[PDB]
Design an enzyme around this catalytic site. Structure first.
Site, PDB file in Angstrom:
ATOM      1  N   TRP A 158      30.138  44.541  37.551  1.00 54.38           N
ATOM      2  CA  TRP A 158      31.411  43.656  37.771  1.00 54.38           C
ATOM      3  C   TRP A 158      32.095  44.064  39.124  1.00 54.38           C
ATOM      4  O   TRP A 158      32.083  45.264  39.340  1.00 54.38           O
ATOM      5  CB  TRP A 158      32.436  43.874  36.707  1.00 54.38           C
ATOM      6  CG  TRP A 158      33.422  42.872  36.963  1.00 54.38           C
ATOM      7  CD1 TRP A 158      33.382  41.533  36.465  1.00 54.38           C
ATOM      8  CD2 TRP A 158      34.939  42.743  37.219  1.00 54.38           C
ATOM      9  NE1 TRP A 158      34.597  40.983  36.873  1.00 54.38           N
ATOM     10  CE2 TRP A 158      35.468  41.620  37.253  1.00 54.38           C
ATOM     11  CE3 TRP A 158      35.631  44.031  37.841  1.00 54.38           C
ATOM     12  CZ2 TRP A 158      36.665  41.587  37.716  1.00 54.38           C
ATOM     13  CZ3 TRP A 158      36.924  43.921  38.372  1.00 54.38           C
ATOM     14  CH2 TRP A 158      37.478  42.830  38.297  1.00 54.38           C
ATOM     15  N   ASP A 159      32.219  42.945  40.113  1.00 55.73           N
ATOM     16  CA  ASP A 159      32.714  43.404  41.407  1.00 55.73           C
ATOM     17  C   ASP A 159      33.829  42.369  41.674  1.00 55.73           C
ATOM     18  O   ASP A 159      33.390  41.334  42.300  1.00 55.73           O
ATOM     19  CB  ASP A 159      31.744  43.534  42.389  1.00 55.73           C
ATOM     20  CG  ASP A 159      30.739  44.732  42.223  1.00 55.73           C
ATOM     21  OD1 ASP A 159      31.075  45.580  41.561  1.00 55.73           O
ATOM     22  OD2 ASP A 159      29.729  44.928  42.783  1.00 55.73           O
ATOM     23  N   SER A 160      35.216  42.692  41.479  1.00 52.86           N
ATOM     24  CA  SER A 160      36.055  41.676  41.817  1.00 52.86           C
ATOM     25  C   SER A 160      35.917  41.425  43.355  1.00 52.86           C
ATOM     26  O   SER A 160      36.373  40.375  43.650  1.00 52.86           O
ATOM     27  CB  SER A 160      37.596  42.296  41.778  1.00 52.86           C
ATOM     28  OG  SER A 160      38.513  41.283  41.858  1.00 52.86           O
ATOM     29  N   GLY A 161      35.594  42.392  44.166  1.00 53.63           N
ATOM     30  CA  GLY A 161      35.423  41.896  45.503  1.00 53.63           C
ATOM     31  C   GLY A 161      34.642  40.691  45.831  1.00 53.63           C
ATOM     32  O   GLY A 161      34.372  40.073  46.892  1.00 53.63           O
ATOM     33  N   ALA A 162      33.547  40.689  44.989  1.00 53.20           N
ATOM     34  CA  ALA A 162      32.411  39.277  45.097  1.00 53.20           C
ATOM     35  C   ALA A 162      33.166  38.093  44.474  1.00 53.20           C
ATOM     36  O   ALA A 162      33.827  37.968  43.313  1.00 53.20           O
ATOM     37  CB  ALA A 162      31.265  39.695  44.205  1.00 53.20           C
TER      38      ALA A 162
END
EC number: 2.7.7.49
Length: 91
Positions: A16-20
């Site tokens: 999971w990557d909020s930056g993406a």
């Protein structure tokens, strides 16, 4: 701690990557697929275009479909816009 996800019935780990802002998957899932739309990206070395693929995969035991980009990585990338429930605690 990698997350669990199932693509086309294939079970693999995800991150999971909020930056993406868009889900990212390995070409291994698009080798025999087809991008519904494409995106144009400008880089210092030159202009590159990224293809977009709409696939269906289960997110933590939850059927969810979203567009993913092909990447040389060996896993999958989930964005906060596609998995909005992940941010909220499970009930």
């Amino acid at each position: 701690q990698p997350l669990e996800a199932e693509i086309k019935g294939t079970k693999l780990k995800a991150h999971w990557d909020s930056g993406a802002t868009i889900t990212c998957v390995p070409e291994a899932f698009l080798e025999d697929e087809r991008p519904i739309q494409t995106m144009l990206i400008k880089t210092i070395h030159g202009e590159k275009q990224q293809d977009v693929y709409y696939l269906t995969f289960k997110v933590q035991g939850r059927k969810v479909e979203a567009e993913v980009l092909a990447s040389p990585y060996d896993y999958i990338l989930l964005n906060p816009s596609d998995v909005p429930w992940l941010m909220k605690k499970p009930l």
